[PDB]
Structure formats: C-alpha cells, structure tokens
C-alpha cells in the first residue's frame, strides 16, 4: 500500500518541536537515543534511515540479529516514531526527525519484560555496538565522539518492583552522562512506577489534546507530554493511534535529543543530566523544568509535574 502524505501529529506541535528543526533535527553525529521497548519495524519507510542499531536482550541473551530485534508487538515502533519519524513526504514526523536510534528489544511480543532483560538493555545502551563503555578511559561516555554510547535512554514501560541491581544499572547510566526518561505508569497511582520513580530518571505523565492530565496517568511525574490520541508509526510499514504514558515518554526523549544535539553542535560538549530539583539552565533537567508549560496550579504539581515540555524554549535555554 502507498504511504500516506505526511502530517504532523498534534503532540509534536504541542511540544513545540517543528520550530527547532532549522537549528537541528537531532542529526548530530555523536547523538543516539536508545529506546528500550518491544523492538522496531526496522525497514519502515518512515523510520529506517534513523535506525542506527537494532538489538535484543530477551531471555538474557544479547542478539543483534534483525529477526530477533524486530518488533512483534507494535509498541516500540510507535514510540520510536514519536521520537524520530523522518521529515519527508510520508507518514508522520518525530520530535527529532534526524536522530539516530538504538532500538533495544527488552519487551516480548506480548509487551511484557523481565527486569533482568531490561537491565541488560540499559547495559547495551551504555556499551553501544562496540561492547565497550569508555574506550579511551577518559570518563566521558555520553557525548564522547570516540565512544558510541547513547545519550538518552527511553523506557516506555514500568513495574512495581525496586531492585538494587536494576538501580545500580540506572546509576551506571546516569554516571555515563545519559539522560534517562521513563513513563510514569497508567494505573492512576499516586506516584510513578519503576524505573520512572528513581531520582536519576525523568518520570513522564500524559496529557490529552485539551491539555488535561489523562485519568490513567500515574501522579507525581517530573514533566508531562502528549499521551492520548497519538498517531505514530506501527507495523507493518503503517501507522496507528495509541494512548499511554508510553506515548508521552518519547516526546520528552525527543526534546532531550534536540537539547543535546543543539548543545553539541554549538559547543562540542553535552549538558549534564541534572536532578529533579534543578531549576537552572545549566542541566538538561533544569532546562526541561524551567521551560515547561506550567499547567494546573502554579508550579510543580502532582498531575503535570513541572509542566508540558516545550522543545523550542528548551533549546533556546540551552544555547542562550
């Protein structure tokens, strides 16, 4: 079937991505976004050019075979398209439509995943294709052009358990300089699921096209983003509309990719990750917080977090 003519989904517009693309579409050589999910439809015409690495960690076995890394569910393909669908004549367009993606398959065809597989996936995003975290020994991993580590790890998934080996891996990612982004969860709970709940991870809640928080969105997130009626890529070489904090997550990861790409383009370095409390323009998370559209009551609140991410303003903050 003939591909449909390109449209910009409402959520891409909401997070103020299109005005950034004249500065960068995310296609800065050193920047990769690792999406830990159900895999990817790696030949999708609106994704293929941005799929830089395709791997699987299912059952505790690292595989780089296309057959093993391919998406048997659809969710990963959707998430990836929100971040990085190509700006061209077909389909949709991602927040960062030129960013390299590492698709790391940690969830099976059912969309279920073991924590062990997820932790292996995070390890793989740090190690990159070359199997080595920090080749030159300088302590610089994310943002080091000699290494192939991802700069963003995006986890549109969650569970109730807090395990120390998993947290240890999250800590390794953080110390590598990797911004970690995760869905808050879809149970209408008072706080985010794991790994979103870790201090080193940006928890993302979901808003609808009326700027209301989705009723399912777990509360006390760090930021929020479009997560209801989200059109994106879907297998096979097609498109689908979904809801969930899994759909909000990639919008944030895309914004981070734009920030880091723009910052590297200008300065030849990346910004530090930052912390939940940061309200400066000196870290990624600080920039996300200060530029977010503060919905609901003034200030951080349990529904929106700091607010709805806005790529245009974030990138200006980064480059200012």
């Amino acid at each position: 079937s003939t591909q449909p003519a390109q449209t910009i989904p409402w959520g891409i517009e909401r997070v103020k991505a299109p005005s950034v693309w004249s500065i960068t579409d995310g296609s800065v050589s050193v920047i990769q976004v690792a999406v830990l999910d159900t895999g990817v439809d790696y030949d999708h015409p609106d994704l293929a050019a941005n799929i830089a690495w395709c791997v699987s960690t299912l059952r505790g076995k690292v595989s780089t075979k296309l057959r093993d890394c391919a998406d048997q569910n659809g969710h990963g393909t959707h998430v990836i398209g929100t971040i990085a669908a190509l700006n061209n004549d077909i389909g949709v367009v991602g927040v960062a439509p030129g960013v390299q993606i590492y698709s790391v398959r940690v969830l099976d065809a059912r969309g279920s995943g073991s924590y062990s597989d997820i932790a292996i996936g995070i390890e793989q995003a740090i190690l990159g294709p070359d199997g080595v975290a920090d080749k030159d020994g300088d302590g610089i991993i994310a943002g080091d052009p000699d290494d192939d580590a991802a700069e963003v790890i995006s986890m549109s998934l969650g569970g109730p358990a807090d395990d120390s080996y998993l947290y240890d891996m999250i800590i390794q990612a953080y110390n590598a300089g990797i911004v970690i982004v995760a869905a808050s969860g879809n149970e209408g709970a008072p706080s985010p699921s794991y790994p979103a709940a870790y201090p080193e991870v940006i928890a993302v809640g979901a808003i609808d096209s009326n700027d209301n928080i989705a009723s399912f969105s777990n509360r006390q997130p760090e930021v929020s983003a479009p997560g209801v009626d989200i059109l994106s890529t879907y297998p096979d070489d097609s498109y689908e509309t979904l809801m969930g904090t899994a759909m909000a997550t990639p919008h944030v990861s895309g914004v981070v990719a734009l920030i880091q790409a723009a910052y590297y383009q200008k300065y030849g370095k990346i910004l530090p990750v930052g912390t939940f409390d940061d309200i400066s323009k000196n870290t990624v998370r600080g920039i996300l917080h200060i530029t977010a559209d503060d919905l609901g009551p003034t200030g951080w609140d349990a529904d929106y977090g700091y607010g709805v991410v806005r790529a245009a303003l974030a990138v200006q903050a980064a480059l200012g």
């Binding site: 279920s112 062990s116 549109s156 998934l157 969860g185």
Partner: protein, 65 residues
Amino acid sequence: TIRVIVSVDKAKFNPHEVLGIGGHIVYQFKLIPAVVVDVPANAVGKLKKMPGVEKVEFDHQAVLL
C-alpha cells in the same frame, strides 16, 4: 528453575560457585557486579550465603505503558 539476579563483589566471587546447587549462569553483567542465574527455587537461600554474594533478587516483570 527460577531466574534470579545475584549482586557480588567481583574480586571475591567466581561464577562457578553457583553450579553445585544446580545453578547455571545466564548473563554476567559488564557494568555492574551482578549475574543473572537460573536455579532451583529451593536453592535461593543457598546463594545468599556464598562467598562474594551481596544480594539475591527475584526477576520481576514490567509491562508496556
């Protein structure tokens, strides 16, 4: 068997330690001092007391959101 994840002091642990209790090694992490192991459910308490073992944790589940 069940699948668990063992945290260790790498300098005080050798993965062969777990074989005598029916364990087998699934994955040795490169970036954290831990190993994913398949073992008899009855042997979990045994792992906890092995040289270099700091913690044994169950393999939990996450789902797509």
